Amino acid sequence: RTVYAFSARPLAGGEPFNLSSLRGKVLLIENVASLXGTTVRDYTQMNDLQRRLGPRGLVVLGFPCNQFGHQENAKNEEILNCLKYVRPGGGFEPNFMLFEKCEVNGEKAHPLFAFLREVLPTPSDDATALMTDPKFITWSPVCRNDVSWNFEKFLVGPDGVPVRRYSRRFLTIDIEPDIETLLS
Amino acid sequence: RTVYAFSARPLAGGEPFNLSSLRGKVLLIENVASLXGTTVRDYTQMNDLQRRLGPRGLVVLGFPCNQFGHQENAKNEEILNCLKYVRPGGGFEPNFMLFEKCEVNGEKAHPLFAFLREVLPTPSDDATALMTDPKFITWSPVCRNDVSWNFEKFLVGPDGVPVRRYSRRFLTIDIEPDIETLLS
Amino acid sequence: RTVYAFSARPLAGGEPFNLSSLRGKVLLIENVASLXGTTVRDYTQMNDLQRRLGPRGLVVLGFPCNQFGHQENAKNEEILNCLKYVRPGGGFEPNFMLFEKCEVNGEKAHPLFAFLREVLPTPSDDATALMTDPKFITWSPVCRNDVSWNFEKFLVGPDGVPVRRYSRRFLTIDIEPDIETLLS
Amino acid sequence: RTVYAFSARPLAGGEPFNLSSLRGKVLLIENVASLXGTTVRDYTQMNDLQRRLGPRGLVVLGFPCNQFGHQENAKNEEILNCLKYVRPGGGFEPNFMLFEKCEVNGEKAHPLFAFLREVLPTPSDDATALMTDPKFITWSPVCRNDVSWNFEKFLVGPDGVPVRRYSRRFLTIDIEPDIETLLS
């Protein structure tokens, strides 16, 4: 089983992009939010990765999600303006694909994220922490493989097959060595 | 007891503003958030009241709060950027005072808000509703007089004594007759 | 993995019976209720099986459960009187072990039932029906392997290992041929 | 309009009993269930009122209903068996009339109950509560005057006109002063 079964709508406006278009690419999927504490670090790093490694086969995929401290409250139409004007601000524009706002955990989760969580049930660098304060767990049902926060990272190989999952605490730029490995 | 006992720091950068300055003014106090469903409507109608009734003694005061579905996630520094370029966007600017972000409910509430809730314990148009879904109550302790949501309104007389409180659902513009009655 | 890991409290009064006592026996576990439509049929049949096949190695285990149309509403102390005086009535007494009232589905389910449902995820005779009227699904979370109603049947071999699951519609007496097979 | 327009079948075996017989009587009508938390308390205090105030013109009428957490799952034939040997048990017998099991809410409600709820639309001691958990509302349609739970009480005057309605929480014995007032 691969990611190629799935599709998502581009942020910019509907007309469903099928992940089977990206066959033979190395994918770096993140769930993103515009008003997180690691917003700037991960968006800056994802643009850097995309710019440098894109021509060698890397594609970075961003999926906005409001589940985690509601850090993506805006509408689909307002998300680019947050990024640009508020945070990271300064004229920022993602150089990579963003999709419509969807859920990653719970009964309404996007089937791409239900898959990624099934095939890679814990992050490689932090097998056990789920959430420190329960009050943030607002979706149902709650599963052992759930995404913990904004900016979890999932690395998919050139054959569609999910390779590793990194926590909210793992830096986007430190995924580079594993990416090079799949690129080679 | 009046509001003139209290002070707040302005959004832009503190130097604590005493509310005792506003003697002789009619005050319209709201707790605000940039990413709410009634953001465009309340901010528009506050701007409108401030412009039209300002010259005759109305002062509108806006207090950013992240307690209600976390609809003010940005820092004090990014808030005007939210309003101008995201929502309402289009170059929107508040024509009235905004103070730093603070809590209105629970043990760390700003003392102005602990005050207001003490002397006007339920909103004049909805005495009973507190919250439909308990998942949003994340503050402690929970008191019967607590503020339900973004954009509750408090009307204060020109002697600094709180007159009336209005719920999350009461239109800002519909308080205009009550302001008239005090303004007169 | 076997049933021997588990224990339950006897209906009659606490002092936890460990299923590892029954090692080398063939177990027929049912979830039971006293005011079901198949109450009489399954209780009569379970006593017959127990009486006839008990001396050859069969043990019938009954677990009262209120999850299904709340058909076991009484307290643990009142269950024997229902059976005896109401339904099946007539002086009826189960000849086999009953345990305290517990849940079979949802987050509070007895770990024995979470296991049985995991290792045998659908009934052998009805792979797909869960519930006809959703209004009866009152537990959370809802899982694909859930027990549908009162009187599901689980057959465990002489080595602890769960062998087959029969639906609410399968007669207790028609499990006899499979039982003989494990007994031999 | 009075109760004398209506009839019901007795628990034991129908021959429809006209309520117009009870002219000159004060009536205490309850919707009952054998397996509720207030079963022992209401049935005791109904027995008590019937015995003591019967000779002076009180008639207590009990209507079995399975609409509220299904606390009357038995058939009309087993109900007295429930009361006598399970709960309250100990040989308990109602000293007053019981009618067959019927619904009190929704499109198939008994007409006596559709009547009662029409002319006494909220319980005199709790006008607002309907149900804390919506999972228990399984009837259709749902009306503002619906009966909340097992053991609501209706007091009817000796002219067959309904006087007052009391909630699930109002003690049966505490209606004694109101019965006195009508009895006089």
UniProtKB/Swiss-Prot annotation, chains A, B, C, D:
Active site: 36
Main location: cytoplasm
Localization per Swiss-Prot or TrEMBL: Cytoplasm; Mitochondrion
Modified residues (N6-acetyllysine): 75, 101, 108, 135
Site-annotated residues for Subject to oxidation and hydroselenide loss to dehydroalanine: 36
Site description Not glycated, residues in chain: 25, 75, 84, 108, 135, 153
Glycosylation sites: 101
Enzyme Commission designation: 1.11.1.9, 1.11.1.12
Database matches in PROSITE patterns: GLUTATHIONE_PEROXID_1 (PS00460), GLUTATHIONE_PEROXID_2 (PS00763), GLUTATHIONE_PEROXID_3 (PS51355)
Record note on quaternary structure: Homotetramer. Interacts with MIEN1.
PANTHER family, alphabetized: GLUTATHIONE PEROXIDASE, GLUTATHIONE PEROXIDASE 1
Family: Belongs to the glutathione peroxidase family.
Protein's recorded name: Glutathione peroxidase 1
Species name: Bos taurus (Bovine)
